[PDB]
Write a protein that binds this ligand. Structure first.
Ligand code: FAD
Ligand code: FAD
Ligand code: ZN
Ligand code: ZN
Lengths: 466, 467
């Protein structure tokens, strides 16, 4: 809210930065406009300097200068973050990883990838898929998000159900600390219990403890067969039983279980002009499988589908194994987030709740907000207990905000839930962590912040309470 | 040797304070304190004069508060199955045992989230969740004695790591009591939660130097409908590696374990524990487990895998079992190697991560470098994870053999950019060999964390960071 007492970038700093990163000092005001606006376009900084380093040493030397001079630094990846973490609040220097986009190694047997933090996820998937491997994560933002940003936010995504957390799949990190110190935790070993797992501190630290410059990550083998079932369910009770049966009948081949409601389908059709492949239903379920024997998987899917259609859990369904049609079906889920931001102003919540009542809050909000909201939708990673709750209006209303907050956060807390399951904290949620974290935890976080960045030059105004 | 730091000593008034804090949980008898003072390997012995056995988190909080005010050093202990001297005192540190913190708090029968006290015994937790058709995400030969809190503190790997991965992924939350007695509540029994720093991660693998784990929340995978085990003889290590490659290619996602052992391992388990080999004599053996939803499909995958393995000469003889009794018998041949080694003599133990292609090289080398001074040398362990268990046995400890083994084994590992402690951790034994696997700047940040969280250093002194 109020600017902390940081120094201001002088002409001497610009000349220093040009020496440190020649060719990588952008000061054109119109060029700085885009990197100052977050993905949602509701926060806008006034940074006048963007730095685009190529190597880790350049990053180390930049922070060295910023440390001695007490200049605030805003690390930025793909700028797809959802919580206002990726753009300055005032005039923080934007340090972009855009040019740190080289792959450093890939071991063709272990599947271990070492790459720079600014490699785009989409591009890394292509690289390892040419070598019969896949990334352990995927997101709708794959086209723009940087692997460094994924690690900094501890991104979940669409294959978390199968491959799990970056806390498990990240093997090593190189991090540049606030004072310029290069921390080498860039191991490429599957197992290494020689002291504290220091890298874990930086996974989910959202650039407040250091800038990730190099990532080592374990890539799963590429599946021989990927199948997608897109199913229509007549209610949420059946969605939950479809999930239960899916785990019983598909089991270890399951790689994704996503859901969306009717309004979500309508919004992707209206704003993005993507047609539904099944009959209209109140709820839709996208199931993905990944396995080593295509015939065994297809056999598992067949028996699962026949009984689920037979027991009335699903009303209408379409299956796909052709690469083109799988991506078609995935687009119906992946592009919901785009359709919402085209419907007007979006109030965005990312909650962890008990799966058995994951949708109850959507129905509650629909009764609580009547004609004062345009749409209320619920979708997301049901398999991981993670609901994406969004309310749209043609324009922002302080009334509607007062109706949504703190009510939504209080409901989640009554369920011992998380007020930010995946997207993190950043600027937007810094003052609502008390609904998921007790004061002693939040205090220790501040002590770690004070140890690693005593001057607070890395990402001020985030991601800890005011 | 190592010098005792200037901690206070336990007085009669401290003993009365502990009797107040945990009624009936103070053990002072020297004959009762012998056993908790000796490590599993029986090569380190402490001189602790008091064992505290709290039942509740509040009791642990109050104990540590007193020790912090009094400047009394504390040695946390679980099952005392640790392999690196971290589990017993060096001098007269108070032994704080989790033996009586053995309650399950809750288990959600759909999400599979378990919450239990740190001192619950792994095998007992497995029995509890398996009755409800879930399994623990980790298993190890120590299951009968090790505590879940110990496993988290050591970041235990084990026999199903290849399938379910690290505790850094499967632990959902922890309650931890800090050195000053502050109860840190990171007990987030949620699959996903990105509301600030993942504080629990600091305590996974910290071996009781940053706090005492009192409650664990852990994600339990579903119990597989079908479990198969194959036990195979290979004519050389190259065929072992090709058997692994082929195994991943043909079994894929149903693979739940891949373990190897050498001929000498098989001989010792047979010689000391009387377990007969079910396959023809071979220089290497491989145990494969599969876990899946469809018995028929898993059987077809396994049938074709063996067909191809026997066809191309990768495996010379093999047997398969699905009967629960027979499955356990095959698993016993691998699980009980560690017991058989310590009955054979004095054991020099090394736990190394290396490039899988050269995992066994060190065993051949050491067999040549040493001579009749080694009674036996073996190599076995978690090949799928790149993890070798190197052991050398002898009739008695000798300085000459230790000098031949060290630093040579640690230099070999650094030469391969490997880990000198893959899973067992650091503790007392390896505190001064971290330079082979971790750079100075990383080692410094760990010391700063220790100073922040335990500025008096009362929690597990003489471990697990460098001097
Ligand atoms: C269409 C869409 C779909 C999405 N789907 C998902 C999803 O399924 N799951 C999910 O979890 N999230 C999802 N997200 C949001 C997700 O958090 C981001 O897309 C991504 O994880 C962040 O990458 P980025 O390069 O955009 O990082 P940025 O937005 O540039 O940065 C995000 C934060 O991390 C910090 N940071 C970035 N890079 C670094 C670095 N190298 N070192 C240190 N700190 C750094 C920034 O300072 C900021 O605080 C989605 C976003 C969009 C737009
Ligand atoms: C037969 C056998 C097989 C084994 N197999 C494996 C294997 O497959 N994989 C593997 O990784 N290891 C294995 N181990 C060793 C492994 O380190 C231990 O078995 C186990 O992980 C430690 O559990 P514990 O409760 O016995 O811990 P302890 O031995 O009691 O303690 C170990 C360390 O953790 C600390 N500690 C213990 N409890 C707590 C607590 N509640 N809070 C904080 N710190 C605590 C202690 O202070 C000590 O430094 C094996 C050991 C044996 C004897
Ligand atoms: Zn998401
Ligand atoms: Zn082991």
């Amino acid at each position: 809210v109020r600017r902390l007492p940081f120094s201001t970038v002088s002409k001497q700093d610009l000349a220093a930065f040009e020496r440190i990163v020649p060719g990588g000092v952008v000061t054109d005001p119109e060029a700085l406009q885009a990197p100052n606006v977050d993905w949602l376009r509701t926060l806008r900084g006034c940074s006048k300097v963007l730095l685009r380093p190529r190597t880790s040493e350049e990053v180390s030397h930049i922070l060295r200068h910023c440390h001695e001079r007490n200049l605030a630094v805003n690390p930025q990846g793909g700028n797809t973050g959802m919580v206002g973490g990726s753009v300055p609040v005032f005039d923080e220097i934007i340090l972009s990883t855009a040019r740190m986009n080289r792959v450093l190694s890939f071991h063709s047997v272990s599947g271990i990838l070492v790459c720079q933090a600014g490699c785009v996820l989409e591009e890394l998937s292509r690289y390892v898929e040419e070598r019969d491997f896949i990334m352990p994560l995927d997101l709708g933002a794959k086209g723009s998000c940087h692997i460094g940003g994924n690690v900094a936010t501890n991104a979940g995504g669409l294959r978390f159900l199968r491959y799990g957390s970056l806390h498990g799949t990240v093997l090593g990190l190189e991090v540049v600390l606030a004072d310029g110190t290069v921390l080498d935790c860039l191991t490429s070993l599957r197992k290494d219990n020689t002291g504290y797992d220091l890298k874990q501190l930086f996974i989910g630290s959202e650039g407040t403890l250091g800038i990730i410059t190099t990532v080592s990550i374990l890539c799963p083998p590429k599946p021989r067969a990927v199948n997608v079932a897109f199913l229509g369910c007549p209610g949420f009770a059946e969605v939950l039983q479809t999930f239960s049966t899916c785990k019983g009948m598909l089991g270890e081949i399951l790689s994704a279980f996503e859901f969306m409601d009717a309004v979500c389908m309508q919004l992707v059709g209206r704003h993005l002009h993507l047609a539904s492949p099944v009959q209209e239903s109140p709820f839709y379920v996208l199931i993905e499988t990944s396995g080593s024997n295509a015939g065994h998987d297809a056999e598992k899917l067949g028996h699962f589908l026949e009984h689920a259609l037979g027991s009335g859990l699903v009303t209408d369904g379409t299956m796909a194994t052709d690469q083109r049609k799988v991506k078609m079906l995935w687009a119906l889920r992946e592009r919901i987030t785009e359709a919402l931001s085209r419907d007007g102003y979006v109030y965005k919540y990312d909650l962890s709740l008990p799966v058995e009542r994951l949708y109850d809050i959507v129905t509650d909000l629909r009764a609580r907000l009547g004609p004062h909201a345009k749409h209320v939708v619920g979708y997301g990673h049901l398999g991981d207990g993670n609901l994406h709750l969004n309310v749209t209006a043609e324009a922002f209303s302080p009334s509607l905000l007062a109706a949504l907050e703190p009510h939504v956060y209080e409901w989640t807390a009554g369920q011992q839930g998380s007020v930010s399951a995946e997207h993190g904290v950043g600027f937007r949620k810094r003052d609502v962590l008390g609904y998921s974290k007790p004061p002693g935890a939040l205090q220790l976080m501040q002590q770690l912040k004070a140890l690693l960045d005593p001057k607070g030059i890395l990402n001020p105004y985030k991601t800890l309470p005011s």
